[PDB]
Amino acid sequence: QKFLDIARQTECFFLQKRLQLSVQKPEQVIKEDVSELRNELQRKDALVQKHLTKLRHWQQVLEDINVQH
Amino acid sequence: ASEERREIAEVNKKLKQKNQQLKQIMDQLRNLIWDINAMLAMRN
Amino acid sequence: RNQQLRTLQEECDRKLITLRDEISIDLYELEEEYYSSSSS
Amino acid sequence: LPPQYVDDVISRIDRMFPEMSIHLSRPNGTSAMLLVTLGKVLKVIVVMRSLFIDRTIVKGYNENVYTEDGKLDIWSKSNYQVFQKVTDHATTALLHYQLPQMPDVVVRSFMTWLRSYIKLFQAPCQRCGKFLQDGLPPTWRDFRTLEAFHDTCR
Amino acid sequence: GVTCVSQMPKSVQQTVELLTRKLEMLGAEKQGTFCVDCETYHTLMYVMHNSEYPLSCFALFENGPCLIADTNFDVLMVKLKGFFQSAKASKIETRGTRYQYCDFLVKVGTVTMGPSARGISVEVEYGPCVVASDCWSLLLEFLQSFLGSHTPGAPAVFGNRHDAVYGPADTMVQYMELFNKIRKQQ
Amino acid sequence: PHWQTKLEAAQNVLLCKEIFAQLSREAVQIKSQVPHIVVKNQIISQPFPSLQLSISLCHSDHLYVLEHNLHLLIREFHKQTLSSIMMPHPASAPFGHKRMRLSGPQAFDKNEINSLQSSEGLLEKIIKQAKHIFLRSRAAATIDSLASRIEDPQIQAHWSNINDVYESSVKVLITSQGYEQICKSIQLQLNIGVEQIRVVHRDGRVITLSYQEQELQDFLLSQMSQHQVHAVQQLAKVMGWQVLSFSNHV
Ligand SMILES: [Zn+2]
């Protein structure tokens, strides 16, 4: 188990070392930021659509319980 | 690229503006869940 | 009449609680989203 | 999680520990408010939503549990300092046993903690005498090793 | 909750102040003045007018049935005196100053068989729990700081059932035993 | 029915006039360390230094959670009389509060019985609530504002779904950028009391609190710097790095 971790913590270290060196010259991390921010907004709007239809659905029944009184 | 940074700022501004729309929602949703419980807990 | 009126108060409350219940789960999922907002 | 699933999980909790007795009133909407009695030592009311507990009011056996009707009246704190400290410790300890992934373990993890409280007033702490600086007995069980050292003790 | 009533006997009056001083060293706020009163009858029976239970009257026997009755129970006794022998010999009342310490409600007062004042009584009622005998270990260590080298080993009022409610009633049985010793000697 | 609505408005007015009278008598007759003021139709009071309660009958800003609660709270006061609780389950007994009649003969204590009879009437039952309705806001806005102001760690607040008047339950999960799994750290359950908030810290420490908004904001900021230090410790546990001297406070 201890051999598992150290050989793995060394593996990610190599990639992590590349990441910062790969952060500098290319624009890819910025490009991933473009996608991630776009995805985050898309998820935000999708949550809204879930909100409105549910909120509108509740608005109907509450009004319905009022017309019946 | 300088232009790419500008688009990120535009995306951030839109996202930041959308966040303002979102914060009001919680306050309203929060306020409603506050009010319903306070009104009900006092029920006779 | 006192009997029939009490049912309405209990009836609307039952539906009223369910509104609070569903908003609670809806608020909880939304509440997390605002704090998750990155860079803003 | 489904409302029916909540009852099954808690009903399963009662089986493991003979001393604990759990009552499921559910006065509010689909938020179980199970009541746990630890034999005769103490009572407690915990509110939980969708099988994720978020509060614990540890009222002693002496103190009343309801107010004017079957209403559970979770809020009313204990009139004794000892149970007040346990309330905070239960309030704090409830969190440390929260695993976001699994809903079943967190409830069970909290109960074995509460089950460890049956021996209150009778177990010395490993660090100093049973009775501490203030008027409180142990009132502090470690999360993993089940020690008895007080609030002032670490 | 759970209590250990006992007596801790020159300068008997000075003992209370000295004993209170020992209590004061620990630190306990003066939250009132308790007043426990005992009454005595022939056939016997005792009605224990206890403080901190303003309504309860606590009628009791030597070893038998005990009932908890509101303050009006006394009015029955005075009116019922005809068939009984009321106020047969003397009424012993013990009044003292309440010293509630951080949920321990420990009180000490000089028992006064009016107006003699021959004894000292210590009340150490521990509110939290009703379970007492299988919880007795707590009270002793609280005592050891209060009094010196003569801790009462056990109150002896505990019959040790499988599941044990104690409540307030059996405490009055404990008070009577202390009063019995005081009455018997001097 | 036109006659029905006309009568309903009158009944509401007669009840409303009673509500102000109950508050209006209570405010000046008794004192609770607060300077109530009486004007024609406005009972001005100052529960907090920064709050002004305009409970003003209006004849012919509106919370509607405090306003409605008055109408309902009065009934409980009205209900206490001529109720089913008063009557004795034993056929022969004087009329009395059922819980009270079983209190005296069951050896209840000096403190509990006194507490039950010490009901505060009407004004205290609402001022204390407004004394909590807005203290919640000052503690809710600060948490909401703090998330936007400080972006380095992310404050997270999971507000409880059952928060009755005179109490509110909080969750706070102060996690860093996106490292929820690798780094889960101090999360405190803040409790909004009537006068002062109450928190219990993750490690076990209990902090009572102050009531002012500024004091709360300081506490979160102090817990802010603590988490970033804890992030070092968590990485030390999971990174190839090993721990050295730790100083949780100072
Ligand atoms: Zn210790």
PDB file of C-alpha atoms in Angstrom, chain F residues 20-219:
ATOM      1  CA  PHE F  20     -52.858  47.393  19.293  1.00  0.00           C
ATOM      2  CA  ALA F  21     -54.555  47.842  22.666  1.00  0.00           C
ATOM      3  CA  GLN F  22     -52.853  44.686  23.955  1.00  0.00           C
ATOM      4  CA  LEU F  23     -49.470  45.898  22.704  1.00  0.00           C
ATOM      5  CA  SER F  24     -50.183  49.484  23.692  1.00  0.00           C
ATOM      6  CA  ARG F  25     -51.061  48.681  27.311  1.00  0.00           C
ATOM      7  CA  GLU F  26     -48.186  46.204  27.604  1.00  0.00           C
ATOM      8  CA  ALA F  27     -45.516  48.556  26.259  1.00  0.00           C
ATOM      9  CA  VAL F  28     -45.839  51.289  28.886  1.00  0.00           C
ATOM     10  CA  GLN F  29     -47.109  49.214  31.827  1.00  0.00           C
ATOM     11  CA  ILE F  30     -44.103  46.859  31.910  1.00  0.00           C
ATOM     12  CA  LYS F  31     -40.410  47.368  31.178  1.00  0.00           C
ATOM     13  CA  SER F  32     -37.898  44.967  29.626  1.00  0.00           C
ATOM     14  CA  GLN F  33     -34.780  47.156  29.406  1.00  0.00           C
ATOM     15  CA  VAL F  34     -36.121  48.747  26.211  1.00  0.00           C
ATOM     16  CA  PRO F  35     -37.488  52.315  25.676  1.00  0.00           C
ATOM     17  CA  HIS F  36     -40.928  51.829  24.144  1.00  0.00           C
ATOM     18  CA  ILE F  37     -42.636  54.981  22.856  1.00  0.00           C
ATOM     19  CA  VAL F  38     -46.376  55.543  22.381  1.00  0.00           C
ATOM     20  CA  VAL F  39     -47.854  57.854  19.734  1.00  0.00           C
ATOM     21  CA  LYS F  40     -51.401  58.214  18.364  1.00  0.00           C
ATOM     22  CA  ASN F  41     -51.278  54.943  16.413  1.00  0.00           C
ATOM     23  CA  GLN F  42     -47.537  54.120  16.362  1.00  0.00           C
ATOM     24  CA  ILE F  43     -45.814  52.140  19.118  1.00  0.00           C
ATOM     25  CA  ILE F  44     -42.192  53.001  18.360  1.00  0.00           C
ATOM     26  CA  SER F  45     -39.625  50.727  20.006  1.00  0.00           C
ATOM     27  CA  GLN F  46     -35.897  50.031  19.675  1.00  0.00           C
ATOM     28  CA  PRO F  47     -35.128  46.315  20.107  1.00  0.00           C
ATOM     29  CA  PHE F  48     -31.629  46.747  18.648  1.00  0.00           C
ATOM     30  CA  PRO F  49     -29.481  49.890  18.412  1.00  0.00           C
ATOM     31  CA  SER F  50     -29.836  49.830  14.605  1.00  0.00           C
ATOM     32  CA  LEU F  51     -33.511  48.776  14.434  1.00  0.00           C
ATOM     33  CA  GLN F  52     -36.788  50.678  14.741  1.00  0.00           C
ATOM     34  CA  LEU F  53     -40.084  48.802  15.122  1.00  0.00           C
ATOM     35  CA  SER F  54     -43.024  50.670  13.562  1.00  0.00           C
ATOM     36  CA  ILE F  55     -45.931  48.529  14.743  1.00  0.00           C
ATOM     37  CA  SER F  56     -48.483  51.071  13.524  1.00  0.00           C
ATOM     38  CA  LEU F  57     -52.202  50.441  13.171  1.00  0.00           C
ATOM     39  CA  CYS F  58     -53.240  51.940   9.826  1.00  0.00           C
ATOM     40  CA  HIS F  59     -56.852  53.082   9.474  1.00  0.00           C
ATOM     41  CA  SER F  60     -58.835  53.890   6.338  1.00  0.00           C
ATOM     42  CA  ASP F  61     -41.065  47.441   4.657  1.00  0.00           C
ATOM     43  CA  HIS F  62     -44.202  45.480   5.573  1.00  0.00           C
ATOM     44  CA  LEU F  63     -42.624  42.189   6.643  1.00  0.00           C
ATOM     45  CA  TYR F  64     -45.927  40.265   6.784  1.00  0.00           C
ATOM     46  CA  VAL F  65     -44.118  37.540   8.718  1.00  0.00           C
ATOM     47  CA  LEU F  66     -44.096  39.677  11.854  1.00  0.00           C
ATOM     48  CA  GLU F  67     -47.455  41.283  11.030  1.00  0.00           C
ATOM     49  CA  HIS F  68     -49.333  38.023  10.494  1.00  0.00           C
ATOM     50  CA  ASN F  69     -47.742  36.501  13.585  1.00  0.00           C
ATOM     51  CA  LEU F  70     -49.470  39.137  15.727  1.00  0.00           C
ATOM     52  CA  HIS F  71     -52.922  38.032  14.567  1.00  0.00           C
ATOM     53  CA  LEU F  72     -52.084  34.388  15.270  1.00  0.00           C
ATOM     54  CA  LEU F  73     -50.147  35.070  18.481  1.00  0.00           C
ATOM     55  CA  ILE F  74     -53.142  36.854  20.020  1.00  0.00           C
ATOM     56  CA  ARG F  75     -55.351  33.797  19.557  1.00  0.00           C
ATOM     57  CA  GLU F  76     -52.974  31.708  21.667  1.00  0.00           C
ATOM     58  CA  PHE F  77     -53.451  34.340  24.374  1.00  0.00           C
ATOM     59  CA  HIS F  78     -57.211  34.190  23.794  1.00  0.00           C
ATOM     60  CA  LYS F  79     -57.058  30.390  23.613  1.00  0.00           C
ATOM     61  CA  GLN F  80     -55.429  30.105  27.043  1.00  0.00           C
ATOM     62  CA  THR F  81     -58.864  30.866  28.501  1.00  0.00           C
ATOM     63  CA  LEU F  82     -61.965  28.707  28.033  1.00  0.00           C
ATOM     64  CA  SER F  83     -59.868  25.933  26.473  1.00  0.00           C
ATOM     65  CA  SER F  84     -60.132  22.156  26.663  1.00  0.00           C
ATOM     66  CA  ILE F  85     -56.872  21.995  28.642  1.00  0.00           C
ATOM     67  CA  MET F  86     -58.475  23.845  31.562  1.00  0.00           C
ATOM     68  CA  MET F  87     -60.975  21.090  32.296  1.00  0.00           C
ATOM     69  CA  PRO F  88     -59.999  18.165  34.549  1.00  0.00           C
ATOM     70  CA  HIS F  89     -59.792  14.643  33.178  1.00  0.00           C
ATOM     71  CA  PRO F  90     -61.006  13.592  36.651  1.00  0.00           C
ATOM     72  CA  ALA F  91     -64.648  14.627  36.694  1.00  0.00           C
ATOM     73  CA  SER F  92     -64.407  16.292  40.117  1.00  0.00           C
ATOM     74  CA  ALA F  93     -61.702  18.960  40.322  1.00  0.00           C
ATOM     75  CA  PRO F  94     -61.385  22.759  40.098  1.00  0.00           C
ATOM     76  CA  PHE F  95     -60.767  24.271  36.692  1.00  0.00           C
ATOM     77  CA  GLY F  96     -57.047  24.659  36.112  1.00  0.00           C
ATOM     78  CA  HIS F  97     -54.315  24.380  33.518  1.00  0.00           C
ATOM     79  CA  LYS F  98     -54.096  20.617  33.033  1.00  0.00           C
ATOM     80  CA  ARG F  99     -50.298  20.614  32.900  1.00  0.00           C
ATOM     81  CA  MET F 100     -50.326  22.796  36.021  1.00  0.00           C
ATOM     82  CA  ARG F 101     -52.687  20.555  37.992  1.00  0.00           C
ATOM     83  CA  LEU F 102     -50.474  17.523  37.323  1.00  0.00           C
ATOM     84  CA  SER F 103     -47.366  19.573  38.160  1.00  0.00           C
ATOM     85  CA  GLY F 104     -48.065  20.257  41.832  1.00  0.00           C
ATOM     86  CA  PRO F 105     -48.916  16.683  42.844  1.00  0.00           C
ATOM     87  CA  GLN F 106     -46.087  15.113  40.791  1.00  0.00           C
ATOM     88  CA  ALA F 107     -43.318  16.966  42.659  1.00  0.00           C
ATOM     89  CA  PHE F 108     -42.147  19.257  39.888  1.00  0.00           C
ATOM     90  CA  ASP F 109     -39.317  21.586  40.825  1.00  0.00           C
ATOM     91  CA  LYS F 110     -39.207  25.190  42.026  1.00  0.00           C
ATOM     92  CA  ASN F 111     -37.751  26.428  38.731  1.00  0.00           C
ATOM     93  CA  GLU F 112     -39.839  24.647  36.090  1.00  0.00           C
ATOM     94  CA  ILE F 113     -43.212  25.612  37.587  1.00  0.00           C
ATOM     95  CA  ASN F 114     -42.152  29.238  37.929  1.00  0.00           C
ATOM     96  CA  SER F 115     -40.896  29.234  34.334  1.00  0.00           C
ATOM     97  CA  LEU F 116     -44.215  27.984  32.940  1.00  0.00           C
ATOM     98  CA  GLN F 117     -46.213  30.720  34.693  1.00  0.00           C
ATOM     99  CA  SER F 118     -43.772  33.446  33.559  1.00  0.00           C
ATOM    100  CA  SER F 119     -45.282  33.867  30.079  1.00  0.00           C
ATOM    101  CA  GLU F 120     -44.284  37.215  28.598  1.00  0.00           C
ATOM    102  CA  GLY F 121     -47.631  38.293  27.133  1.00  0.00           C
ATOM    103  CA  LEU F 122     -47.625  39.818  23.655  1.00  0.00           C
ATOM    104  CA  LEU F 123     -45.054  42.578  23.115  1.00  0.00           C
ATOM    105  CA  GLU F 124     -42.099  40.551  24.385  1.00  0.00           C
ATOM    106  CA  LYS F 125     -43.151  37.608  22.201  1.00  0.00           C
ATOM    107  CA  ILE F 126     -42.908  39.838  19.098  1.00  0.00           C
ATOM    108  CA  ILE F 127     -40.061  42.215  19.970  1.00  0.00           C
ATOM    109  CA  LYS F 128     -37.836  39.203  20.668  1.00  0.00           C
ATOM    110  CA  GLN F 129     -38.865  37.791  17.295  1.00  0.00           C
ATOM    111  CA  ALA F 130     -38.108  41.010  15.428  1.00  0.00           C
ATOM    112  CA  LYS F 131     -35.031  40.868  17.660  1.00  0.00           C
ATOM    113  CA  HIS F 132     -34.266  37.662  15.715  1.00  0.00           C
ATOM    114  CA  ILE F 133     -35.849  38.263  12.301  1.00  0.00           C
ATOM    115  CA  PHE F 134     -33.277  40.942  11.449  1.00  0.00           C
ATOM    116  CA  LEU F 135     -30.316  39.630  13.450  1.00  0.00           C
ATOM    117  CA  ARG F 136     -30.740  36.728  11.039  1.00  0.00           C
ATOM    118  CA  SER F 137     -30.527  39.204   8.156  1.00  0.00           C
ATOM    119  CA  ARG F 138     -27.332  40.801   9.472  1.00  0.00           C
ATOM    120  CA  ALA F 139     -25.830  37.314   9.812  1.00  0.00           C
ATOM    121  CA  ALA F 140     -27.334  36.144   6.506  1.00  0.00           C
ATOM    122  CA  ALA F 141     -26.256  39.129   4.400  1.00  0.00           C
ATOM    123  CA  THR F 142     -22.726  38.995   5.821  1.00  0.00           C
ATOM    124  CA  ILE F 143     -22.340  35.331   4.871  1.00  0.00           C
ATOM    125  CA  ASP F 144     -23.797  36.060   1.433  1.00  0.00           C
ATOM    126  CA  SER F 145     -21.594  39.135   1.018  1.00  0.00           C
ATOM    127  CA  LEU F 146     -18.476  37.370   2.306  1.00  0.00           C
ATOM    128  CA  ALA F 147     -18.716  34.756  -0.453  1.00  0.00           C
ATOM    129  CA  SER F 148     -18.517  37.442  -3.144  1.00  0.00           C
ATOM    130  CA  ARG F 149     -15.843  39.544  -1.428  1.00  0.00           C
ATOM    131  CA  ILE F 150     -13.388  36.702  -0.730  1.00  0.00           C
ATOM    132  CA  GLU F 151     -12.943  34.318  -3.667  1.00  0.00           C
ATOM    133  CA  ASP F 152      -9.815  32.484  -2.468  1.00  0.00           C
ATOM    134  CA  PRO F 153     -11.692  30.033  -0.224  1.00  0.00           C
ATOM    135  CA  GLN F 154     -15.387  29.470  -0.867  1.00  0.00           C
ATOM    136  CA  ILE F 155     -17.758  29.961   2.042  1.00  0.00           C
ATOM    137  CA  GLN F 156     -20.711  27.588   1.711  1.00  0.00           C
ATOM    138  CA  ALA F 157     -23.950  27.945   3.682  1.00  0.00           C
ATOM    139  CA  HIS F 158     -26.533  25.143   3.766  1.00  0.00           C
ATOM    140  CA  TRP F 159     -29.473  26.742   5.567  1.00  0.00           C
ATOM    141  CA  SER F 160     -31.756  24.430   7.516  1.00  0.00           C
ATOM    142  CA  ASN F 161     -35.278  23.742   6.272  1.00  0.00           C
ATOM    143  CA  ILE F 162     -36.812  23.947   9.781  1.00  0.00           C
ATOM    144  CA  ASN F 163     -35.947  27.276  11.455  1.00  0.00           C
ATOM    145  CA  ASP F 164     -38.709  28.281  13.856  1.00  0.00           C
ATOM    146  CA  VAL F 165     -38.970  31.767  15.321  1.00  0.00           C
ATOM    147  CA  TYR F 166     -36.399  32.402  18.089  1.00  0.00           C
ATOM    148  CA  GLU F 167     -33.869  30.066  16.428  1.00  0.00           C
ATOM    149  CA  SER F 168     -32.185  29.300  13.121  1.00  0.00           C
ATOM    150  CA  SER F 169     -29.685  26.603  12.168  1.00  0.00           C
ATOM    151  CA  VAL F 170     -26.671  27.107   9.909  1.00  0.00           C
ATOM    152  CA  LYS F 171     -24.147  25.021   8.047  1.00  0.00           C
ATOM    153  CA  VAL F 172     -20.795  26.441   6.957  1.00  0.00           C
ATOM    154  CA  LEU F 173     -18.377  24.436   4.787  1.00  0.00           C
ATOM    155  CA  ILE F 174     -15.227  26.491   4.150  1.00  0.00           C
ATOM    156  CA  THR F 175     -13.558  24.628   1.283  1.00  0.00           C
ATOM    157  CA  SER F 176     -10.903  25.928  -1.091  1.00  0.00           C
ATOM    158  CA  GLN F 177     -11.203  26.460  -4.859  1.00  0.00           C
ATOM    159  CA  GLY F 178     -12.506  23.063  -5.975  1.00  0.00           C
ATOM    160  CA  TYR F 179     -10.702  20.600  -3.716  1.00  0.00           C
ATOM    161  CA  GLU F 180     -13.782  19.297  -1.909  1.00  0.00           C
ATOM    162  CA  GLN F 181     -12.717  15.640  -1.790  1.00  0.00           C
ATOM    163  CA  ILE F 182      -8.971  15.881  -1.147  1.00  0.00           C
ATOM    164  CA  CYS F 183      -9.488  18.790   1.279  1.00  0.00           C
ATOM    165  CA  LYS F 184     -12.576  18.805   3.486  1.00  0.00           C
ATOM    166  CA  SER F 185     -11.903  20.966   6.518  1.00  0.00           C
ATOM    167  CA  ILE F 186     -13.426  23.159   9.230  1.00  0.00           C
ATOM    168  CA  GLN F 187     -17.216  23.344   8.952  1.00  0.00           C
ATOM    169  CA  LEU F 188     -19.095  25.071  11.772  1.00  0.00           C
ATOM    170  CA  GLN F 189     -22.786  24.866  12.678  1.00  0.00           C
ATOM    171  CA  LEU F 190     -23.734  28.462  13.445  1.00  0.00           C
ATOM    172  CA  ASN F 191     -26.901  28.975  15.510  1.00  0.00           C
ATOM    173  CA  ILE F 192     -28.796  32.273  15.316  1.00  0.00           C
ATOM    174  CA  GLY F 193     -30.164  32.998  18.787  1.00  0.00           C
ATOM    175  CA  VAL F 194     -32.548  35.706  19.938  1.00  0.00           C
ATOM    176  CA  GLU F 195     -29.856  37.958  21.444  1.00  0.00           C
ATOM    177  CA  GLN F 196     -26.531  36.429  20.370  1.00  0.00           C
ATOM    178  CA  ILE F 197     -25.561  33.921  17.714  1.00  0.00           C
ATOM    179  CA  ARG F 198     -24.014  30.596  18.789  1.00  0.00           C
ATOM    180  CA  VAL F 199     -21.453  28.565  16.811  1.00  0.00           C
ATOM    181  CA  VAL F 200     -19.784  25.237  17.505  1.00  0.00           C
ATOM    182  CA  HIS F 201     -16.486  24.784  15.700  1.00  0.00           C
ATOM    183  CA  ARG F 202     -15.393  21.746  13.705  1.00  0.00           C
ATOM    184  CA  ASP F 203     -12.592  20.657  16.034  1.00  0.00           C
ATOM    185  CA  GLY F 204     -14.846  20.915  19.090  1.00  0.00           C
ATOM    186  CA  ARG F 205     -14.377  24.477  20.300  1.00  0.00           C
ATOM    187  CA  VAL F 206     -17.543  26.403  21.169  1.00  0.00           C
ATOM    188  CA  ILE F 207     -17.681  30.167  20.630  1.00  0.00           C
ATOM    189  CA  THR F 208     -20.659  31.974  22.146  1.00  0.00           C
ATOM    190  CA  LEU F 209     -20.591  35.086  19.931  1.00  0.00           C
ATOM    191  CA  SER F 210     -21.453  38.765  19.786  1.00  0.00           C
ATOM    192  CA  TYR F 211     -24.709  40.076  18.334  1.00  0.00           C
ATOM    193  CA  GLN F 212     -23.246  42.811  16.127  1.00  0.00           C
ATOM    194  CA  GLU F 213     -22.687  42.076  12.448  1.00  0.00           C
ATOM    195  CA  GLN F 214     -19.060  43.221  12.543  1.00  0.00           C
ATOM    196  CA  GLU F 215     -18.101  40.630  15.161  1.00  0.00           C
ATOM    197  CA  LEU F 216     -19.453  37.780  13.025  1.00  0.00           C
ATOM    198  CA  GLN F 217     -17.566  38.983   9.948  1.00  0.00           C
ATOM    199  CA  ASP F 218     -14.355  39.006  11.986  1.00  0.00           C
ATOM    200  CA  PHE F 219     -14.926  35.421  13.134  1.00  0.00           C
TER     201      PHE F 219
END
